[PDB]
Each structure stands twice: as C-alpha cells, then as structure tokens.
Design a binder for these strands. Structure first.
Lengths: 222, 245, 62, 110, 54, 190, 70
RNA sequence: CGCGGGGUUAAGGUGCCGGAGUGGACGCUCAUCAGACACCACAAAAGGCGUUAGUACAUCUUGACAGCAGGACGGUGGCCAUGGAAGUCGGAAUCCGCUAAGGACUGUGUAACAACUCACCUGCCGAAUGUACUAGCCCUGAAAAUGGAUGGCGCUCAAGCGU
RNA sequence: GGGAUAACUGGCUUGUGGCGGCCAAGCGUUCAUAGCGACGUCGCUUUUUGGAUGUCGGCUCUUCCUAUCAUACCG
C-alpha cells in the first residue's frame, strides 16, 4: 500500500455486491432508529441526544427559511486585533499569609473567602485591618471590560476598588462582589473625550459573581 | 397524529409552476388560435419525445402545443356553446391522450407528406414488443454489448457495472475489466436481455438504453386537421383507428 | 479465552459427539449388550395377566 | 484548584467546576479546525510510501506519458496506473527487485 | 438492555409523609411567589371556519 | 375514530383451491399445498363474488385495517406461491480461495443440506440446514451461482438470508475483503 | 409492467390507504369549495373594513395629540 | 364525649384482605418495574415515524399527495482560475431560446469526459389531502450500592384516568 | 457583658463557564417592544511556527453497584 489503495482496489475490483442495497436500507431505517432511540434511551444519553436533535432541528429550520427567502427573492474583531497588535508590538520593542504566620509565631485569624484586588506588591496594613488575611490565588489583576458603545470587550488592568455596595468593610478591603464599581485603565481602548482629549481611568461595574466564576467581568461606564 | 413520512424538502431553485402556468397555457392557445389556419391534431402513443424539439426547429414556421390533454381541449372549448371557432369542438373530441396540437399556415398535403417522411430510430419504451433476440457474448461486455464488432468497440465502464448488476446481468468486474463470465471468455453461457416477440418491460428497456440499442421508431401519427375557413375537422387513418372520447 | 459455556464451543462439542465418539461408544455398547444377553440367557385374573388391585390428601373428606 | 481549595459552599464548588469545564470546552471549540487538519495529515502520513534513502535506489523520471509506469511495472511487482493521460500518477510509486541476491528499490516519479 | 432478565433497584411509589409535607409547603411558597410577582408587575379567536353556517 | 366497516378484496385464479376453516388458510395448487394459521388477528372472511374473497373488519381501528392490508398481502403471496412459485438466484464470489458449495438431500427429514468450504480459506465447513419444501440446485447456466426454488416465499427468503448471514466476514476490512455469498435475483419460477 | 424499488416483484399494485373513503360526493364537495371561498372572501372585506376604521381612529387621535402639543 | 336499644349520615369507600357495586353512561391510555384522588422539582420555544381530538393556512377531474412509464433540452466544454475542473475540487454572476418543463443545476460518478440521478414537466390511476401549531393519555427527560413496596395481593373495553 | 440560633442535609447529587451584543417563537401594561425571552454566532479569557497535597493510616475478609481495566459480542 503506497497510495490511495482502497480507491485503487475499488477501481480494480469494485465494492461489495450488497453495499448499495443495505446502505439504502439503513438510510430508510434511519427514521425508525431515531424514534426508537428517542423513546428508549435513558440517563444522560437521552439528554445529549435530545440537545443534539434540538440543535439540528434549529439549523435545519434556519436552512429551510434561508432557501425560502433566497428563492422568493429575485468591527469588533478589527478593534480587538488592533489593540492586541499594539500590545504585541509594545512587548516586542513576602506574602501576607506567611507574614501573619510569622506574627503568630512571634479563631483569631479571619481569612477573606471572596476575591479581592491589592495593587502594590507589598503593604503593611494598619492594625485596624491587619488581621484580615486575603489568600494568594483569589485576587485578580485584570478584568474583562465590556464597552456599552462600539460593542467591544477587552481585558484591561484593574486600577483600584471604589465602592462595594454589599459592605463598606468589603469596599475598604477591595472585595469584588457583583455590581461593584472599580476604576479601570482604558488607555488601550483610546476613547476620546471632550476637547479632543483621551481618558485613561474610568468606572466599571463588575456585573458577575467572581466567587461563582473566577473570571471577573465588568461593564464600562461611558 | 404521528407515524408519517418525513417529507424531504427540496433544496433547489426550481419550484411548482401551478395555476399561473395553466392560465398561461389557456392564454397562449386562445391567442394563437386566430393567426393560423390549419390546426392539426397528432398523437405520439409510446415513443420518447426528444425529437419534438427537432421537429419544432424544422417547422420553425408553425406553432406546436403539448400539455394536459384535458387542459388543452378545454382551452379549445369542449362544449360547442363555449367554443372559440366552429369545429374546434370536433377537434376537442378528437383530443384524447398523448396528443399534441399544430397550428400551421401552409399546405396540409405537404404537412402530411413531411410527417409521413419523418422517422427516427429510438430506444424502446416500456410495453412494446421486442423484434430481436439481442444478447451479449459470454466474453467481455463492451459499450454496446456486442452490437458493433468487438474489435472496434470500447469496453463499458466499471461505473456502469453496478447498475448492470442491479438490473440483473450476472456480471463481474475482475482486474478492472467488466465481464459476464471469465476475462479470457467462455466459462459462462451468456445473457439474453430480450427475446423475439417478448413484451419489453422497464428493466429490458433500461438495458437497451444503457447498451445503446435502438428498437423503436419515433414517428408522429396525425389524427386529423381542422381548417379555419371551413370550420370542420377531417380525420385521416390514425384519426379513425385511435379510440377517442 | 472463550467460556466453557460459549455457543461456538458447544456447537463444536456437539459436532464431535455426533461424528467421532458416536460410533465408538455405539460399538462398545453393542458388545456390552451382547455379553449382557449372553449372561442373561446363561383364567386371566387367576393367572395374573390382568392387572388387579394389590393385596387421601387429594379429595376432601366425605 | 486554588479556587476550589478556598471554596466555601456546595454551590460554590458547583459553579466553579462548571466554569472550569466550560473553559476547556470553549478551548476545544476554538481548536475545532486544527484537529481536522491534523487528522488529514495523519491519514496521509499513514498512507505514505516508505523508502530507504540510504539503500540502493533507482529513480525513473522524465516527462509524463513517456512510459515510466510501464517500465516500473515491467521491472518490479508494483501496481502503478498505466492509464494514458497526462498526469496519471500524482504520487511517488515504489517497487523492489533482486539482482544477484541483492535488494534494489525502484521509484517512479510523476 | 438486559432489564428483562436482571431487574434493577425499584423506585418506590410509597410516598413519605415528610416528602409530602415538604412538597406542600414549597408549592404554597410557589403560589405566594407567583402572587408577589403578579402584584409587582413591571383578541377573540373568532368563529371557526368549519362551522356550517358561518 | 372507530371505523364502522372496512373491506379488502383478494382475487383468486381459476386453478386454485382455497379453504379457511376457522382461520387456517389452506391454499392448494399445482405445485403443492400451503397452510398458514391467521388466528392472531380479527378478520371476517367471505366470498364476495365468484372468484374474489372479501376480508373485512367491523368496528375496528386503524391498526386493525392495517392488519387487514398486511394479511391481504400475505394471502396474495400464498396465491402467487401456489400459482408461479418463487426463485432466488444466489451468487458467490471469491478473490484467491475458490469457495466450494455442495448440496445434498438428507433423506431422513427429507431436507436439503448445503455445505460451504474454503470460504476465505477457513478449514471449518459451514453446513446449513435447508427450509422444508424449497429446493436447491447448482446452476449450470452461470458459474458460481446457485438457484433456490420453492413455494413458500417466507421459507425461501429466510433460507437465502440464512445463507447470506452464515457466510459473513469477521474482524476484516469489508472494503478490501469482498468474499461472500450474495443475493442476485428474486423472481417467479414462471 | 414497471419495476419496483426493492427486489420484490411479486408485490401487487396496492391502493392508497383510505379508511375515510366514500363518505362524501365530489360535486357536493365542490359546492362546499365555493361556499368556503366565499366565506373567506367575506371575512377579508370585514377585517379590512374594521382595520381601516381602527387606523382612521388612530390617525385622528394622533392629530388631536399633535394639536394639544402645539 | 354519662350508660344502653333502634334508625340515618359526614369525611372516606363498595375486586379480596374489608362491611358495602367486578353498578350504569360516554371516551382516552399499553408504560423493558404505567397509573392509582386531592401537592411539586427534575423540565426546557426538550426530544418522540405512539395514539386521539382540534385550530389556521395551501392543492384538488382545471385530476390533489404517493406511485409506475418517460422527458429532464439548446446557446454552452457559460466567466475567472490550471496537469487537467465540461452543471456537480474552487470565487463571482446566474441570462436567453424552446418551452409542457428543465436550475449556467440536487446528489452519485470520471484524470477530464461520459453516464446515472435530483428539481421541474407529460402520460397511467382516481378522491382526499398536507404544513405548522394547541390540547388530552403514554416513552425519555438521569440512575448506584442488604431484599420491599399505589399498604399487600394484584389489576389492562381496569381494580388507571375525566365527567 | 447582654441578645439570637440548640446543629446539617435529606427525590440533594453528575458532562458540557461567565459578561455584553445580534437573532429570536411566543407571551406581555394595549399589541414581539414596560418588557421577559432558549439554540446558535460574535468580542474577552484565548494564540502566526510543537506540581498540588496533613495527621493518619496498613493489611486482610464478606457483600453489593456499575459510571466496564480485561475476557465475550457485535456498530
């Protein structure tokens, strides 16, 4: 077998003597097979089959109406690519937990179970907030900001946290709950303000539940 | 309720013609009645109708119509009370089956002579009577099945091999060559597709069509003709022989 | 490995039984029965030809 | 893993696992086309003739229709289409022969 | 499937009073929630064609 | 909708003897006798004209009239079997190992036995017992072809399927290995 | 005789499945044809008149609103 | 709500255990663990070629759907591209004649052809259909680990469901 | 120091992310626009050259489930 030997063998000998007939018969039996599958399967498999069949019906109806209308009748990618290419060209051209452990060595601990934002790498907090530990992984540095106009969504760095309506204590710490307005750098977006002027930092409302879904999503306020 | 055929939608441009097409046919026949003088009525009982296009191209001068017999007959006017011109009711009662109309401006005798001289070979339709015991040799099956001499005959295709096997030939495609029996020959006996006097069925007719064997004669039988001035129809030969209602 | 109760093995065993061990066991039992026979030959009511009575949880007591 | 390690509720773990598996699902969904391309290249690289460049080899070349395929069928036991049209063979074909107890590999080029 | 020869664990139809009570309370809560949403807030078909004397 | 009445008609030719005692349709013809019990369905049989049998349902459902249609077809097939009989021209193909087929009348039970050897070189001999009433012959007109002739369509078709199923390839590429015994022609004796 | 899609040739020419057969007469069916067509037409002018009146009322209301705004 | 005799009822029941109807009328449903009387989540504009009723539209002797016998052409191997691409590997346009109808074409197929087949159209037959939805009953719509539950037996023109 | 909850789940659990837009049958305050609204697609995560884990365990034995590693069977 050097090259496309099955079609060479079909050219030299042909197929089975029964292939066309039984292929037609299977194509005909397909409907009864589908009905039996719909009426007999059970346990996650009927669920997968039902979702697949519902989808397939959706595209089938879409195709039917598309052909009907055509027979009767006789920039977000660009913006994202520009921002990403600018970033690529620009590129081309101790922890609080161990600190608190050392303090303890030298229920008294409360650890915040909600995502937060710090900013500066190392900070020694005033004693009023010293014992509010925040874990390593739960912070998020950048947020997915969706711009209501121009219909573009871009990942932009988080500047700071301004107001968490759930708790002023969460606000002061930097807890990122649902609907929480933070300050976001929008230099990459390049929106032009009055006097033909550009803006760098703007309000964005975190609108998801980051504890439910780690990815942090905000809608920009313009 | 349930348990019904899955209707296969046709993802293709061409659609039903319908009521608009039928009223177009009324309009065409009714408007083409006045200009011409001799409205011939003819029959093509059991012949393939490819060569109607050629006879159209030949008698470019005339105008020919062929649809639903009922549709054309009533467009003419079956009842004499609702009739475009006298005698057209007679033409309608002539119109029964595989029947076409022929508006002409010229000599009926010349029309009759030309249509008598018209004669083409054709592949047989289903239901006819076979005149020959045509068969294929036990050796290699060729393009026409041995009608032309094998030395000047190209072999038939492995693409057509499955169709021949489906339609009944005990043929086998060995070493890329399609053969009834053995590649060298002999071994088997042979396959006679149809016999003398046998009523050809759809299977045998498809066999002759695949092997390019013609055993039918395309000819048009003029039932009659109606003159505009006289307003009467004169039947000739096929007119009286062919049953009509 | 195919199970001892596999259908294919059962069919092969039946074929072996009917085709191989059959005649051998037949001839064996033939000579055995022959030697058995060698060793073995080595009024109606008053005579007992008519079978009579010798010498109830099915029906309810009456 | 860190998010689940710091998870605090059953619904927390619910939505975290759902979100992660969604991320992998979307990643493969974007990977849809490379899988098709790599499947096709796998199929051909499987149905690719295997020659030995080092061993004794004889290549047959020229214009099409000269008779290269006929020569290779004559000299070795390899099936090469001998159909008489311009580019009959679209791929390299390989046969082998013995010559005083020695192996040679013959290659037919298109 | 081989359910015919080897039946599985049966699904009991003998409802427990605790389950019945929970369903009753939750359904009552559903009715109250529907009422609350309704209070919060934010075409005649015609004579049938097949009627003989339309 | 509970249809009040429905009927179907079956014409019989001039040379048969049909009898339905309770529901045992027994048809007698030149080649032999075919008997089938139809006790599993509710039908009323009558002779509606000189040579047409009317099978009817009264106060039945759509499933019942469907049963009427299918039993009509089965009775028609029995008529066709006793008038003309059925023939199945069977073909076998091989690539390098010629298949050997031998048909023998096992006198006890009076039945054909067909043995197949050298099917893709397996030393196993595939022996298939043949349906009662149908006859098998090795065709002499064509090569590597058998003929299965009989009266009962169900019997002859089931036997042909049994042959085509016993000659089945295992764990091999069907695209390359084309050996087997296949149905070629299905028709009437006459 | 033509050919059938399956290899079966012995199958007789079957009639269309028709349990509701011979219940109505065609000519009567045609009178019902005409009556149904006329009823549909009547529905059409009734609906058209009602919709036209409603549209005229809506236009009058809009004109009154414009006059009030002015 | 004292102790007794007799009578009649409520809730609930009248196949047996259980005292009382295998009571009557019209229909629906066959579940590879149906359902069983006063309740819902799984659940969704969810899949069902199960079954019945119904609604709105469309064709119909001017012959409706399905089927069988056929035709399925001409400019033309349409324009760009290229080993070669002719309706059918690729981008765009997608027109006209003949028409009864035939798309610069729905698939099969060729190295390209060829050829088959599709759309559509005529001949044969002859009477309802066929598209989408609403409503009932039924299947699935998710399940682990000792053997058990409409209370049990069991029930299928019910001993299930609606009045 | 006072107050409050004695405590958790029990037809709960699994395989398919979230945010925003487009589309969207239906329903809706009076009508697909007060508005709700599935499947898909688009933008972000996400792209042009290939270690996490604290107390525990360790062994054996019985039984059971399958959401099956192997044996058997086929598409």
């Amino acid at each position: 077998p050097q090259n496309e030997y099955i079609e060479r063998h079909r050219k030299l000998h042909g197929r089975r003597l029964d292939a066309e007939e039984r292929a037609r018969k299977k194509a005909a039996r397909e409907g009864h097979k589908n009905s039996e599958n719909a009426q007999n399967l059970r346990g996650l498999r009927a669920k997968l089959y039902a979702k697949q069949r519902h989808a397939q019906k959706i595209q089938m109806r879409k195709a039917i109406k598309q052909h009907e209308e055509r027979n009767v009748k006789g920039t977000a990618k660009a913006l994202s690519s520009q921002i990403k290419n600018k970033r690529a060209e620009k590129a081309a051209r101790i922890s609080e937990e161990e600190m608190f452990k050392v303090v303890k060595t030298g229920g008294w601990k409360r650890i915040v179970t909600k995502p937060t934002f710090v900013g500066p790498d190392f900070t020694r907090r005033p004693v009023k907030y010293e014992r509010f530990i925040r874990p390593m992984g739960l912070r998020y540095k950048k947020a997915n900001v969706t711009h209501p106009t121009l219909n573009v969504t871009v990942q932009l760095p988080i500047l700071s946290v301004k107001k968490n309506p759930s708790n002023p204590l969460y606000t002061q710490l930097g807890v990122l709950t649902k609907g929480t307005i933070i300050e976001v750098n929008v230099s990459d977006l390049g929106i032009v303000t009055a006097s033909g002027k550009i803006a760098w930092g703007r309000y964005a409302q975190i609108t998801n539940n980051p504890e439910n879904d780690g990815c942090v999503n905000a809608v920009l306020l313009v | 309720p349930k348990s019904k055929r899955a209707r296969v939608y046709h993802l293709i441009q061409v659609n039903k013609k319908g009521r608009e097409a039928k009223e177009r046919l009324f309009s065409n026949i009714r408007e083409t009645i006045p200009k011409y003088q001799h409205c011939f009525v003819f029959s093509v009982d059991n012949m393939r109708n490819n060569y109607l296009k050629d006879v159209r191209h030949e008698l470019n001068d005339c105008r020919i119509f062929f649809g639903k017999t009922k549709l054309m007959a009533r467009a003419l006017g079956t009842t004499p009370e609702e009739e475009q011109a006298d005698g057209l009711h007679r033409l309608t009662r002539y119109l029964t089956g595989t029947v076409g109309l022929l508006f002409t401006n010229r000599d009926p005798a010349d029309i009759e002579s030309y249509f008598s001289n018209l004669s083409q070979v054709d592949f047989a339709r289903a239901g006819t009577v076979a005149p020959r015991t045509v068969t294929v040799p036990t050796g290699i099956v060729y393009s026409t099945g041995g009608e032309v001499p094998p030395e000047h005959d190209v072999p038939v295709s492995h693409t057509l091999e499955p169709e021949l096997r489906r339609l009944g030939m005990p043929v086998r495609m060995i070493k890329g060559k399609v053969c009834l029996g053995d590649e060298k020959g002999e071994a088997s006996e042979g396959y006679t597709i149809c016999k003398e006097g046998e009523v050809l069925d759809s299977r045998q007719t498809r066999l002759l069509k695949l092997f390019s064997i013609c055993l039918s004669e395309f000819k048009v039988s003029l039932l009659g003709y109606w003159n505009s001035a006289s307003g009467e129809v004169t039947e000739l030969e096929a007119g009286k022989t062919r049953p009509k209602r | 490995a195919k199970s001892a109760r596999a259908s294919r093995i059962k069919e092969n065993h039946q074929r072996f039984k009917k085709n191989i061990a059959g005649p051998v066991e037949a001839a064996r039992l033939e000579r055995l029965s022959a030697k058995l026979m060698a060793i073995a030959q080595a009024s109606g009511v008053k005579s007992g030809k008519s079978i009579g009575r010798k010498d109830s949880s099915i029906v309810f007591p009456m | 893993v860190r998010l689940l390690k710091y998870a605090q509720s059953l619904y927390q773990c619910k939505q975290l696992k759902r979100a992660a598996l969604g991320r992998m699902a979307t990643l493969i969904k974007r990977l849809k086309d490379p899988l098709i391309y790599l499947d096709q290249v796998r199929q051909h690289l499987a149905r690719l003739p295997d020659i030995n460049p080092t061993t004794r080899t004889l290549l047959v070349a020229g214009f099409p229709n000269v008779g290269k395929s006929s020569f290779v069928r004559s000299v070795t036991r390899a099936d090469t289409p001998v159909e008489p049209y311009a580019f009959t063979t679209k791929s390299l074909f390989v046969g082998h022969l013995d010559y005083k107890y020695l192996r040679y590999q013959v290659i037919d080029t298109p | 499937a081989g359910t015919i020869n080897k039946p599985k664990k049966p699904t009991s139809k003998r409802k427990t009073t605790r389950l019945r009570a929970k369903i009753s309370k939750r359904a009552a809560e559903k009715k109250r929630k529907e009422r609350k949403l309704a209070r919060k807030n934010p075409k005649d078909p015609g004579i049938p064609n097949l009627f003989p004397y339309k | 909708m509970r249809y009040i009445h429905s009927e179907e008609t079956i014409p019989v030719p001039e040379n048969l003897k049909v009898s339905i005692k309770s529901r045992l349709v027994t048809v007698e013809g030149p080649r032999g006798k075919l008997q089938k019990d139809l006790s599993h369905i509710a039908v009323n049989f009558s002779v509606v004209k000189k040579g047409v049998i009317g099978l009817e349902i009264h106060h039945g459902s759509r499933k019942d009239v469907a049963a009427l249609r299918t039993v009509r077809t089965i009775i028609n097939n029995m008529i066709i079997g006793v008038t003309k009989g059925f023939k199945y021209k069977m073909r076998y193909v091989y690539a390098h190992f010629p298949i050997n087929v031998n048909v023998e009348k096992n006198a006890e039970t009076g039945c054909y036995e067909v043995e197949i050897r050298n099917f893709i070189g397996e030393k196993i001999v595939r022996k298939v017992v043949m349906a009662p009433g149908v006859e098998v012959e090795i065709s002499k007109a064509q090569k590597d072809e058998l003929i299965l002739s009989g009266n009962s369509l169900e019997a002859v078709s089931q036997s042909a399927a049994d042959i085509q199923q016993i000659c089945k390839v295992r764990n091999k590429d069907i695209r390359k290995f084309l050996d087997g015994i296949y149905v070629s022609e299905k028709g009437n004796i006459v | 005789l033509g050919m059938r899609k399956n290899g079966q040739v012995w199958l007789p020419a079957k009639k269309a499945f028709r349990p509701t057969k011979g219940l109505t007469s065609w000519e009567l069916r045609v009178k019902k044809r005409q009556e149904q067509a006329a009823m549909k037409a009547k529905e059409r002018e009734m609906k058209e008149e009602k919709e036209a009146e409603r549209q005229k009322r809506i236009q009058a209301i809009k004109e009154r609103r414009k006059k009030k705004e002015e």
